[PDB]
Amino acid sequence: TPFIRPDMKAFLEAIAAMAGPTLAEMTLEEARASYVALHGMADRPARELAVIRNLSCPGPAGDIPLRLYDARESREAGPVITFYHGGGFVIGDLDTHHNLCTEIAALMDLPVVAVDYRLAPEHPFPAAIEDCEAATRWVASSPSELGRTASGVIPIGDAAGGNATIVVSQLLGAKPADVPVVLQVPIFPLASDAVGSASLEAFAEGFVLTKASIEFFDTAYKADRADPRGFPILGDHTAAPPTIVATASLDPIRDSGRDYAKALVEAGRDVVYLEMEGVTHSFTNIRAAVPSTQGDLERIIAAMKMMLG
Amino acid sequence: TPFIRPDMKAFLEAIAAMAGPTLAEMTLEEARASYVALHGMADRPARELAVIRNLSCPGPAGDIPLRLYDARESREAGPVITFYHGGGFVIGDLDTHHNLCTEIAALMDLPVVAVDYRLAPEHPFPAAIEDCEAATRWVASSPSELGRTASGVIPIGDAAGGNATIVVSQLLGAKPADVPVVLQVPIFPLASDAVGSASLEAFAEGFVLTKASIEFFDTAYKADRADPRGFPILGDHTAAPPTIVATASLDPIRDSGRDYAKALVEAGRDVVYLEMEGVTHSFTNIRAAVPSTQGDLERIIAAMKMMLG
Amino acid sequence: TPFIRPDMKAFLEAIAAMAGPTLAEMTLEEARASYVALHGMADRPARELAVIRNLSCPGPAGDIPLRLYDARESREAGPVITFYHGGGFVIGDLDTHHNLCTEIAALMDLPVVAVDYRLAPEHPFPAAIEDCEAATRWVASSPSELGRTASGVIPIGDAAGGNATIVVSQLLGAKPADVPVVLQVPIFPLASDAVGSASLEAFAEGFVLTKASIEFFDTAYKADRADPRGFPILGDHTAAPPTIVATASLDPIRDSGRDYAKALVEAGRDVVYLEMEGVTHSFTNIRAAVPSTQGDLERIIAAMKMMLG
Amino acid sequence: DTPFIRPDMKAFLEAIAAMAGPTLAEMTLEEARASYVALHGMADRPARELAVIRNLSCPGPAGDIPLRLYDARESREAGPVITFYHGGGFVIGDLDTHHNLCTEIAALMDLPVVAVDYRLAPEHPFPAAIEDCEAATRWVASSPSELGRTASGVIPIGDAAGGNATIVVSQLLGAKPADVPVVLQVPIFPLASDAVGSASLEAFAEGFVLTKASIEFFDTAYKADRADPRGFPILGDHTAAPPTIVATASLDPIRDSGRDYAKALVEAGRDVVYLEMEGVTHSFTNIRAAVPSTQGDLERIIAAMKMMLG
Ligand SMILES: O=[N+]([O-])c1ccc(O)cc1
Ligand SMILES: O=[N+]([O-])c1ccc(O)cc1
Ligand SMILES: O=[N+]([O-])c1ccc(O)cc1
Ligand SMILES: O=[N+]([O-])c1ccc(O)cc1
Ligand SMILES: O=[N+]([O-])c1ccc(O)cc1
Numbered sequence A, B, C: 001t002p003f004i005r006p007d008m009k010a011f012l013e014a015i016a017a018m019a020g021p022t023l024a025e026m027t028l029e030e031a032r033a034s035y036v037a038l039h040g041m042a043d044r045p046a047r048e049l050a051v052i053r054n055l056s057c058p059g060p061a062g063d064i065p066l067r068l069y070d071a072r073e074s075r076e077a078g079p080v081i082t083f084y085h086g087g088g089f090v091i092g093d094l095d096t097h098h099n100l101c102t103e104i105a106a107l108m109d110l111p112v113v114a115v116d117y118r119l120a121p122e123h124p125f126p127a128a129i130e131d132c133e134a135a136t137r138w139v140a141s142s143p144s145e146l147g148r149t150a151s152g153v154i155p156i157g158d159a160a161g162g163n164a165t166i167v168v169s170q171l172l173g174a175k176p177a178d179v180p181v182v183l184q185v186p187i188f189p190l191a192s193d194a195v196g197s198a199s200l201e202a203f204a205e206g207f208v209l210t211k212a213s214i215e216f217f218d219t220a221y222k223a224d225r226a227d228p229r230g231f232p233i234l235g236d237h238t239a240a241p242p243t244i245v246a247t248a249s250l251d252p253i254r255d256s257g258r259d260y261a262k263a264l265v266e267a268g269r270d271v272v273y274l275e276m277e278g279v280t281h282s283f284t285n286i287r288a289a290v291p292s293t294q295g296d297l298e299r300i301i302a303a304m305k306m307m308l309g
Numbered sequence D: 001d002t003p004f005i006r007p008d009m010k011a012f013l014e015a016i017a018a019m020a021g022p023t024l025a026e027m028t029l030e031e032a033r034a035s036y037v038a039l040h041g042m043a044d045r046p047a048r049e050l051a052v053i054r055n056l057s058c059p060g061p062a063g064d065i066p067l068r069l070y071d072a073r074e075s076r077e078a079g080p081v082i083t084f085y086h087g088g089g090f091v092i093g094d095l096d097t098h099h100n101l102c103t104e105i106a107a108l109m110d111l112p113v114v115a116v117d118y119r120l121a122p123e124h125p126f127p128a129a130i131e132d133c134e135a136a137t138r139w140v141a142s143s144p145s146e147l148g149r150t151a152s153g154v155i156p157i158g159d160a161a162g163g164n165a166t167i168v169v170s171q172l173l174g175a176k177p178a179d180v181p182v183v184l185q186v187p188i189f190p191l192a193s194d195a196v197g198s199a200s201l202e203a204f205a206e207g208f209v210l211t212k213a214s215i216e217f218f219d220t221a222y223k224a225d226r227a228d229p230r231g232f233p234i235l236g237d238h239t240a241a242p243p244t245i246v247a248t249a250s251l252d253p254i255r256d257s258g259r260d261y262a263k264a265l266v267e268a269g270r271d272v273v274y275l276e277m278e279g280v281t282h283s284f285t286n287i288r289a290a291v292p293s294t295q296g297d298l299e300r301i302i303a304a305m306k307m308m309l310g
């Protein structure tokens, strides 16, 4: 029996008791709606912020919707956080990760820009990546419409968003935006293919994210397993920016995040590796249902502050 | 053509111009004196503190000399830093690392207890470990002579002291002292055998610590390559305490520290890996000759404060 | 405050940062190794020469080790330099003054024979003098092992070696060797007792040679203050050979050197008195750490060439 | 005693003794001055041939001071300039008595030499000579157009009274700098400390060229107060003395005065070369034909000057 916190185990028991249907079983509208409902019920409420503003920027296939969060209406030049939500590149949007974005903006006292990237299966790989990249470049250019000047960007994201974080840092590393990536924060990222990993076999069912969902997401997104924009473990780590990798000890894709932090050490890159003990995948968005997960996010915040100086 | 900082390059040029003998070509006391002079002449002066006191604790061979450093005349229960110097378990002493110890005490605002462990070749392996373990367990016991109640210990050390840091944390992990290891800070540690590593071949000559010096230390200390008290990469990493591993990009034993941080990630343990760019082995003790290394030490201190809360 | 050169001040600041134990707090082997390490790091490297050879000569206690230095593989009859190292008659050896000897041989284009005389406290006064005298008389005899005929001898030495320089020149003046002393070069010598001098009070601490070291050397050597072989100011100056006296403006024993040159003028003898401005005792052996001291040694060399005609 | 005397030196002294000529007191000033001109004219080596031997003059405190420039070179780089003050007790000597010595110093140093025709006692008593030596040295140190070469520094030099003037000038320029520093001073058998009461004056009072009788005669004419450091520069502040070469003679009645000065410089931590020429007298610099070994003594002073400058 792997270690599980009591608060985390009750939540898994409640999900099992509630016994909802799989992503395969639901329409795309219902599956998307169930993800909204899960974070709506499970996450702490949104922080009150001076700024919660819809924006958009030009993208390779039309405008990309954005949402700006800032505890301040007016601020000095500084790093800007560019956030990419999880959901296998199929589900989630600006609302599923809204409260988490308000928490990051409140606790860091930095602006956060969340990206409403194109979703599969309607828009398969590499749509999401291209929009995450374009939106990050746009923020990094300190456009008038952002309302604050960016000295640097901080890519951050959960799960598929952690994948996007790593891919965007690699793309801006090869072709710089107007300011550097000063820190990346991949949270339970997919970096290496989870297929064949010990974590995926150990946590395949009953740990919030399932092997069933992972196969559902894989079929929708259609990323080539040889493409570094799909599986960024395959990219060049020799100039990776300062990194914080956070994983969960019960995550089926835990070993994917281990793999990435090991590759950064192997390449001589600075990295904070935090493996949250006795919690699952999604821990950043279940901070009311599993209250100890607020402490986990706060450890990531403390690491981010240290790594920015 | 590896990256070298200008101040670091000037220092390596001065050493090369000196063209001194190898440690093995010197008498044993001339080898010890050469390291006293290197650190004495290259390091920043001691910080002024309220408390710098010589004391001793029982060990398996007899008394183990200790030095207490504290910026405060008196303090309540808190973590106590237990420091083990470098020098291949052959050279160094309480004076070679005294200034660095005052700086750790000043910047952390925690008490530091430095250990004058027994040296090889007079006291081969595992004498240094026995003494570092006994002194750390003694500090952890909150003895009245120290006047500083320990809620926790923080093993820290450079090079051989980084080796001792990891071994001590393993031994206390397996048979606890009166309080836990709350953080360990191996700085350019020997964890895996450096023989056959790419870093040892790249940086064998001209980077402060040499392959000749490593061979000299190995002949004197006589650690069995199969004994986890000699090569702690062989130890059980599954319950390792929170860790900061700091390396130098030009260190012949750099890959040993990369190996250890990678082993902690592989085991799901929390770790900060910092690889200082364009500096050598010994960067903690050359902070006057190579002024940019002060900022390197300050990064370790910032990581320590984050990982303690 | 007294005038100090910026390069000299930077070296005194490094010694103050080091804050070593005193010579008396160390073992004899440690005290000796500390001097090796000081000159090893502080002096310019050895010049390359055609001849650097170890030999020995008979003395009153047994064989005296010698080292011959010569820029030329073969040379005709000429003066030979007979060098005696400093170190209070307690520390120093053929290696501590080696580089300086290679420099004197390179810049003078004359052969140099350094004397490894017996040291206190194991061999108290007048052991050092007996050996320096026997070696100088031996060199003056043009022995076939030397491979170079002496037309004359040039005693030279620093500190205790400058004491020995003067004593040896007095002993050979009273009972000639096979060839005369044609020039003597006492460098920061002890001629008159430093105890009670104004320079000893002014420069007792922080100017390389300390009053504590002087007292340490006095206790080991045990020269009687009435014996002219310990305090050669007490000797007969009426037939002193041509002399160069070099002192340092910051030397605790500076006034001893002033006293000797004054005694030579009083007796009508030819003397060059050079007092190096803004440097300490040991300036001859710190020519890498304090680069301006190379020019001080070159002034002594120019005076030597002028006085040899 | 029987002090050591070189055979050539002793031959010169015995020839002077055989002449049994009058004292400075038994002669008129004009006779004393012409007698010294004749002595040096026979006893010194001849003038070296130089590119430049030129009369110049500079303003002084009591009117124009006559000077003579000696240079081996018509045109030279900026460098030190030697400022020379002749001996003769501040009563006798002139530009001509020390002319050949000047040409020799210019030829062997390959530096320009400016000799000062300072005002003589008893017509111009102390401090006239000193005020003229100081004015001329300051004028040379200003690198005036009329000098024809740039001074980077000055080198006071002089024999006997002129060694006295050398030290006093160095002290005056030390307290109130000229446009360039004194880079070296070369007092040759100087009067620094009062010779009265010295062991050398008693030993060498008669028969060694300079006599106690002549010393009394000069003292009477010059009238310097024994407490005035411009008269007796042993009394001045040595703490910032420039690099010095003190040359004395072993048979000089004022030898001990020169010893006293070189000792005071060592006592003050100043760089000094002390050369005491063995078996020769006072005025060895100007008897170099009568006593050929004295050429070697001058050449040692030259070698010391090159070492102390270079
Ligand atoms: O993608 N995800 O992280 C998921 C997917 C399904 C679910 O029920 C919870 C989380
Ligand atoms: O959503 N996710 O975290 C995923 C989705 C697909 C996959 O292959 C691995 C992880
Ligand atoms: O969620 N994700 O990060 C994914 C999903 C599918 C895939 O092929 C690669 C990555
Ligand atoms: O052990 N060390 O770190 C060393 C050893 C030798 C040396 O010259 C410098 C540093
Ligand atoms: O310095 N060290 O850490 C060492 C030295 C020798 C050895 O065999 C193992 C480790």
Ligand SMILES: O=[N+]([O-])c1ccc(O)cc1
Pocket (backbone or CB within 6 Å): B087, B088, B089, B159, B160, B190, B194, B213, B214, B215, B217, B218, B253
């Ligand atoms: O001093 N050191 O860090 C060492 C000593 C020995 C060795 O095998 C490796 C490293």
Ligand SMILES: O=[N+]([O-])c1ccc(O)cc1
Pocket (backbone or CB within 6 Å): C023, C035, C038, C086, C087, C088, C159, C208, C209, C213, C281, C282
């Ligand atoms: O004798 N000496 O020159 C010394 C002795 C000791 C020391 O630390 C420095 C110089």
Ligand SMILES: O=[N+]([O-])c1ccc(O)cc1
Pocket (backbone or CB within 6 Å): C087, C088, C089, C159, C160, C190, C194, C213, C214, C215, C217, C218, C253
């Ligand atoms: O080593 N030294 O230069 C010394 C040693 C002893 C003493 O009394 C004076 C000077």
Ligand SMILES: O=[N+]([O-])c1ccc(O)cc1
Pocket (backbone or CB within 6 Å): C087, C088, C089, C159, C160, C161, C163, C190, C217, C218, C221, C222, C223, C224, C230, C231
């Ligand atoms: O170093 N020295 O020259 C010395 C040392 C001791 C002493 O009594 C006299 C002279």
Ligand SMILES: O=[N+]([O-])c1ccc(O)cc1
Pocket (backbone or CB within 6 Å): D088, D089, D090, D160, D161, D191, D195, D210, D214, D215, D216, D218, D219, D254
């Ligand atoms: O001419 N001289 O050299 C003299 C003249 C007078 C005197 O008191 C001493 C020396």
Ligand SMILES: O=[N+]([O-])c1ccc(O)cc1
Pocket (backbone or CB within 6 Å): D088, D089, D090, D160, D161, D162, D164, D191, D218, D219, D222, D223, D224, D225, D231, D232
């Ligand atoms: O010739 N001199 O140098 C003299 C002459 C007289 C005197 O009072 C002082 C010095």
Ligand SMILES: CCCCCC(=O)O
Pocket (backbone or CB within 6 Å): A198, A199, A202, B266, B267, B268
């Ligand atoms: C097999 C995977 C379960 C967790 C074991 C580990 O921490 O590597």
Ligand SMILES: CCCCCC(=O)O
Pocket (backbone or CB within 6 Å): A266, A267, A268, B198, B199, B202
């Ligand atoms: C060959 C080892 C030197 C540096 C290459 C690296 O960072 O892995």
Ligand SMILES: CCCCCC(=O)O
Pocket (backbone or CB within 6 Å): C198, C199, C202, D267, D268, D269
């Ligand atoms: C008190 C001793 C220090 C130096 C003063 C001098 O040069 O005589």
Ligand SMILES: CCCCCC(=O)O
Pocket (backbone or CB within 6 Å): D027, D028, D029, D030, D031
């Ligand atoms: C200048 C004419 C000579 C006068 C000399 C004298 O008064 O003795």
Ligand SMILES: CCCCCC(=O)O
Pocket (backbone or CB within 6 Å): C266, C267, C268, D199, D200, D203
């Ligand atoms: C005053 C007697 C002359 C010679 C003695 C000496 O050289 O001091």
